[PDB]
Design an enzyme around this catalytic site. Structure first.
Site, PDB file in Angstrom:
ATOM      1  N   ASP A   1      -2.926  -1.900   6.889  1.00 56.23           N
ATOM      2  CA  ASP A   1      -2.918  -0.942   7.980  1.00 56.23           C
ATOM      3  C   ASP A   1      -4.201  -1.026   8.792  1.00 56.23           C
ATOM      4  OD1 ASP A   1      -3.275   1.838   9.295  1.00 56.23           O
ATOM      5  OD2 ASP A   1      -1.221   1.946   8.518  1.00 56.23           O
TER       6      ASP A   1
ATOM      7  N   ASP B   1       0.825  -1.198   0.000  1.00 59.24           N
ATOM      8  CA  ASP B   1       0.000   0.000   0.000  1.00 59.24           C
ATOM      9  C   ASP B   1       0.861   1.249   0.000  1.00 59.24           C
ATOM     10  OD1 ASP B   1      -1.718  -2.033   0.354  1.00 59.24           O
ATOM     11  OD2 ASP B   1      -2.696  -1.221   2.145  1.00 59.24           O
TER      12      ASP B   1
ATOM     13  N   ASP C   1      -8.564  -4.064   6.340  1.00 60.31           N
ATOM     14  CA  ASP C   1      -7.570  -4.813   5.592  1.00 60.31           C
ATOM     15  C   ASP C   1      -7.338  -6.195   6.164  1.00 60.31           C
ATOM     16  OD1 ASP C   1      -7.530  -2.299   4.593  1.00 60.31           O
ATOM     17  OD2 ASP C   1      -5.361  -2.058   4.610  1.00 60.31           O
TER      18      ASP C   1
END
Ligand SMILES: CCCCCCCC/C=C\CCCCCCCC(=O)O[C@@H](COC(=O)CCCCCCCCCCCCCCC)COP(=O)([O-])OCC[N+](C)(C)C
Ligand SMILES: CCCCCCCC/C=C\CCCCCCCC(=O)O[C@@H](COC(=O)CCCCCCCCCCCCCCC)COP(=O)([O-])OCC[N+](C)(C)C
Ligand SMILES: CCCCCCCC/C=C\CCCCCCCC(=O)O[C@@H](COC(=O)CCCCCCCCCCCCCCC)COP(=O)([O-])OCC[N+](C)(C)C
Ligand SMILES: CCCCCCCC/C=C\CCCCCCCC(=O)O[C@@H](COC(=O)CCCCCCCCCCCCCCC)COP(=O)([O-])OCC[N+](C)(C)C
Lengths: 804, 48, 49
Positions: free
Chosen positions: A520, A264, A524
């Site tokens: 995070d 990410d 997720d």
């Protein structure tokens, strides 16, 4: 207690029970020769396990390697670190050592810590309000209050992982159960050979049992589950040095073998803080003076310290970074932010009695202050909007500055871009992760045009997609075989959502990849569970940290990659030893099994003990060696691990059969003056076997990586001990002269080069990897079909940019 | 040893019955089909 | 570096042949070492690099 832990390994453990039950039976029959053999093994087997756990305990206690400033009834008082209770507020200064993991309350001036408690590396990370600090860290700049989360802290959780791991568990423990059967199969397979061939030559059961004692000592290495499990347990403590706390030990093996890292953008690849670019500013009269004007238009005290504004106060290149925007300007009035208008302005007084005005605001609302102040009124509308447009083409959020002489006329000074910039190491890290054989995909919430720029900055490759439009949400006209080709070869996915992150992992794993997803948030977590190694990057919530396989405390891709390089070192340490200690089992089952079958002899039961002792001495130093890691990912390719080990055992047994067969000749053969059949074969076996740890330890060829002084010192100390047995004929029939010993040394150097040759041109060839697994090259695209597809991605990912 | 590595291997099961692997879909054709079900079963939801 | 390894491989491959065949005919280590001196002189050309 160290003497307590020794006798535990003697008693506990059914393999030890069978030996010490056999040690009684031989002793009760007064079979003293086989008594010192079996009791020699228990002193070996419990001896090696102790030095293995003493090595593990030393690294854990060093990983566990004070005062804290607290407030009691509002009174500032200083206590030792042992009195801090979790659920408390601490006080933190510059130069302080963090006693416990703690979350910062709020910062007037933000704080930096070193995460190099053992490494001592110079770099530090920024720490803001609500940020999680970790124990044994040192503050390099800053001050504030911190709320301590625990004392079990992550390092204390990591040390508790290792001590529990001294029992043994994981996927590699499932592999050890798979390896340990096949070595037991190979012991029985030769025991069937040396019992059958000792039944035909009607041999007493005592003579047969001395043969099976010798083949069992060599045949079953009880040191593998002790060494393999300790290697991970030490490795998990080596990874917590690299700020990576594995939730299970199998995370070390899975991170070692990960092939795709879907990282990410917002935390790892970019600094997650806003900063400005001076070469990408407008053609305003001062690019350098433009920033000074905007710093005027922001208040410098906390009452007006907006995060956007606070970015501008600290972009100055001048030595007075904070002072130069208040030098002699003498502010008389300031207008705060009004959300309907989107403008902030500052009015300061010149030394020569002039009331100048400067503003900061949105570029549309800056451009409307006087619509016709600047010349070429229609083109200056177009040029700024166009250069605002290219900022959106670069994704940069844009803010404008305008100026007044004092009378009321506006002067449009310009627009400066502020953007989340890539971290300075990440461009090198993506270059380094590409060398490490794994592919980086950047998953971002930003648009396709925005994140195509970040791909360009990192060098990633600028072939990204809208996650929703491409597919990934159960829609689309694209076939599932083409969506999987796009995801497999995408350089990123922009405008991605947690429902898509699950699909990116799921699509990639149907292709057979091992996918690392960085997570995070709390949303997720379903993707992190699905991903083969789910990474909770720094700043993850409890739901990400609980669902992750490996939890990081150092933000950045470079921390993920350096824990990836370490996990490849940890794996190749456990892999070089398994390939080695299996090959020594095959070496001596093929050699001593065929020595009994063909010639009805073997190496003395006294000498066979010392060979198994000598092989375990390499375990003591394999923990200490400098660790070469393979570039491409590693996977316990057990059909290849068994092909390399069986070939290295067959090659080793051929080399030992050549020395032995020379000695059958009259005049001696390898014996120049005088020698023993056992003393020479014990030496030749001890040399060629223990030097095999030099071959297998190297990621490539054995000459690539020089071994440590610990491993080359332990192997040479054995080769001195094994030689002095041969020269002086200990447990052997005769002395062997120094000239025959140097013939065996030179011959055993020649076989080490043959093995180093075989193991290199066998470890690195995909032809051997293909043959051992039996898996043909089923899905190779045409070379023309790849070219058609490669441009199909470049057209589609252009279309995804143009949807806006 | 023989009975384990013979009872559990489909290679031995294949050889004894003499039945080759006649109908194995392509790995790409499975991916195309797997998503075809996920599109169709989405359509069947939306008919109300 | 790629050529120089394979010639070193080919020296060791014949040195294994002329040591094995000089162990069976039990030859003194001095006689074997005069053979490996001769094969090394021809076997490794230090003139290529
Ligand atoms: C690619 C696969 C090929 C396999 C390699 C084939 C190599 C074999 C090829 C050649 C070996 C034959 C050597 C000829 C010897 C002639 C002289 C002689 O002494 O004969 C002897 C008998 O001879 C035998 O009994 C040989 C039986 C060994 C067969 C082993 C095959 C098993 C393969 C499984 C592979 C093993 C792996 C183990 C599992 C991990 C005389 O009988 P004796 O009286 O007992 O001798 C003296 C006794 N004394 C000194 C006490 C007085
Ligand atoms: C696959 C690998 C194939 C390996 C092929 C093996 C071929 C080798 C077969 C034989 C090698 C030569 C044997 C005869 C040697 C001369 C006999 C003699 O002189 O006296 C001997 C007569 O005692 C005998 O009769 C020996 C019989 C050994 C046959 C063993 C068959 C191995 C089968 C394996 C099947 C594996 C099945 C695995 C397949 C799944 C007695 O010796 P001695 O008097 O006490 O003193 C030593 C005499 N010597 C010093 C002069 C030697
Ligand atoms: C690849 C093959 C490489 C090896 C080829 C070797 C061929 C060369 C063979 C022999 C060389 C010449 C030896 C005899 C010559 C002199 C006559 C004699 O002394 O009788 C001998 C009979 O003992 C034997 O017959 C030895 C039999 C060798 C069997 C080798 C098995 C190879 C398997 C390899 C599979 C590995 C791969 C595994 C793959 C699964 C003496 O026997 P002794 O009782 O011991 O000694 C008495 C003392 N004295 C003799 C000093 C007086
Ligand atoms: C790629 C593989 C390459 C294989 C290379 C093959 C190498 C074979 C090459 C040579 C082998 C034979 C050499 C003959 C030398 C002896 C000469 C002699 O005098 O006769 C001897 C008899 O010899 C014996 O007693 C038995 C020895 C022969 C058995 C060798 C089997 C090799 C197996 C190979 C396994 C391969 C399986 C590997 C499968 C993977 C003298 O005995 P004697 O008359 O009773 O008295 C002696 C008196 N003296 C002591 C004073 C002298």
């Amino acid at each position: 207690e160290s003497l307590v832990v020794k006798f535990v390994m003697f008693f506990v453990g059914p393999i030890q029970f069978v030996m010490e039950a056999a040690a009684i039976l031989a002793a009760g029959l007064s079979d003293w020769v086989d008594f010192g053999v079996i009791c020699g093994l228990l002193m070996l087997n419990a001896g090696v396990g102790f030095v293995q756990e003493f090595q593990a305990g030393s690294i854990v206690d060093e990983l566990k390697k004070n005062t804290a400033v607290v407030i009691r009834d509002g009174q500032l008082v200083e206590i030792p670190a042992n009195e801090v209770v979790p659920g408390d507020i601490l006080q933190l200064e510059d130069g302080t050592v963090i006693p416990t993991d703690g979350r910062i309350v709020t910062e007037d001036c933000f704080l930096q810590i070193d995460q190099s408690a053992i490494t001592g590396e110079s770099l530090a990370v920024d720490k803001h309000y609500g940020d999680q600090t970790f124990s044994s860290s040192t503050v390099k700049r800053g001050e504030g209050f911190m709320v301590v989360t625990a004392t079990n802290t992550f390092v204390g959780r990591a040390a508790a992982l290792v001590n529990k791991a001294a029992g043994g568990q994981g996927h590699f423990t499932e592999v050890l159960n798979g390896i340990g059967i096949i070595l037991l199969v190979l012991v029985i397979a030769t025991l069937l050979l040396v019992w059958t061939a000792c039944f035909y030559r009607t041999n007493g059961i005592v003579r047969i049992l001395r043969y099976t004692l010798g083949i069992t000592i060599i045949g079953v290495p009880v040191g593998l589950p002790a060494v393999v499990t300790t290697t991970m347990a030490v490795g998990a403590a080596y990874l917590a040095k690299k700020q990576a706390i594995v939730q299970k030990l199998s995370a070390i093996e899975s991170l070692a073998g990960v092939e795709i890292l879907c990282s990410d953008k917002t935390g790892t690849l970019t600094k997650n803080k806003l900063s400005l670019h001076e070469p990408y500013t407008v053609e305003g009269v001062s690019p350098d003076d433009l920033m000074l004007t905007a710093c005027l238009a922001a208040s410098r005290k906390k009452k007006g310290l907006d995060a956007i504004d606070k970015a501008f106060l600290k972009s100055l290149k001048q030595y007075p970074k904070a002072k130069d925007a208040l030098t002699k300007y003498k502010v008389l009035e300031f207008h705060p932010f009004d959300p309907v208008s989107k403008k902030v302005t500052a009015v300061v007084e010149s030394p020569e009695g002039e009331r100048i005005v400067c503003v900061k605001g949105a570029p549309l609302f800056v451009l409307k202050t006087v619509e016709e102040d600047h010349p070429i009124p229609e083109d200056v509308h177009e040029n700024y909007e166009n250069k605002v447009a290219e900022l959106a083409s670069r994704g940069f959020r844009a803010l404008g500055v305008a100026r007044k002489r004092g009378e009321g006329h506006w002067e449009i000074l310009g627009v400066m871009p502020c953007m989340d910039p890539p971290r300075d190491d990440t461009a090198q890290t993506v270059s380094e992760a590409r060398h490490l054989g794994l592919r980086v995909k950047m998953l971002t919430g930003d648009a396709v045009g925005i994140a195509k720029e970040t791909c360009r900055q990192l060098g990633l490759g600028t072939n990204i997609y809208n996650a929703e439009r491409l597919g990934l949400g159960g829609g689309g006209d694209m076939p599932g075989s083409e969506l999987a080709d796009f995801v497999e070869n995408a350089d990123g996915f922009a405008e991605v959502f947690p429902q898509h992150k699950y699909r990116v992992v799921e699509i990639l794993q149907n292709r057979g990849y091992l996918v690392a997803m960085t997570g995070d948030g709390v949303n997720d977590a379903p993707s992190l569970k699905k991903a083969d190694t789910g990474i909770a990057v720094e700043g993850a919530t409890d739901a990400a940290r609980s669902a992750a396989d490996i939890v990081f405390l150092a933000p950045g891709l470079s921390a993920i990659i350096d824990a990836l390089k370490t996990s490849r070192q940890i794996f190749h340490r456990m892999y070089s030893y398994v390939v080695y200690r299996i090959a020594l089992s095959l070496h001596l089952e093929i050699f001593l099994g065929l020595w009994i079958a063909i010639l009805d002899n073997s190496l003395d039961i006294d000498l066979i003990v010392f060979i198994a002792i000598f092989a375990d001495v390499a375990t003591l130093a394999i923990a200490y060696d400098n660790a070469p890691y393979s570039p491409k990912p590693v996977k316990w390719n057990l059909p290849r691990l068994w092909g390399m080990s069986i070939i290295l055992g067959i090659v080793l047994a051929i080399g030992s059969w050549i020395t032995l067969t020379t000695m059958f000749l009259p005049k001696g053969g390898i014996i120049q003056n005088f020698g023993a059949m056992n003393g020479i074969m014990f030496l030749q076996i001890s040399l060629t076997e223990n030097w095999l740890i030099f071959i297998t330890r190297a990621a490539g060829p054995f000459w690539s990586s020089i071994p440590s002084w610990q491993l080359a010192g332990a192997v040479f100390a054995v080769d001195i001990i094994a030689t002095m047995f041969t020269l002086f004929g200990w447990w052997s029939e005769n002395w062997t002269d120094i000239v025959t010993v140097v013939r065996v040394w030179i011959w055993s150097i020649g076989i080490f080069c043959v093995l180093g040759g075989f193991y290199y041109e066998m470890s690195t060839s995909e032809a051997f990897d293909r043959l051992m697994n039996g898996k043909p090259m089923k899905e190779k695209k045409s070379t023309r079909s790849v070219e058609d597809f490669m441009a199909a991605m470049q057209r589609v990912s252009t279309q995804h940019e143009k949807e806006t």
